[PDB]
Design a protein around this ligand. Sequence first.
Ligand code: NA
Length: 127
Amino acid sequence: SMNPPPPETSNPNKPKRQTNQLQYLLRVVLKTLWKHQFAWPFQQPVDAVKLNLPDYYKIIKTPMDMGTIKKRLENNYYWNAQECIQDFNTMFTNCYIYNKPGDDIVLMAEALEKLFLQKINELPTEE
Ligand code: NA
């Protein structure tokens, strides 16, 4: 029923890059999803205490959220675009695993995921 430590957003010994694809993931993908009317449940780690989800972290062993992704992008945590894309996919998958089809939160995730897919489709070629 307690919250775990959040995913890390800083690891000085992890090697880092700033690439055109990563810049797109921040400026286009993250920013598009972040401003959406359905972003709010996904803007920070799930607070299982506040939300009264005592079993959340019993079920979800790889938590991810856009607050974490935003910090990772802004603090140049990633080596490549695939790591960040995987984080978005983890976030969506967790929501579908934990919740029931058609729940409000599932519809919200699906709307954000549709936009995510559209933007990833135009991921720029590595420069
Ligand atoms: Na489910």
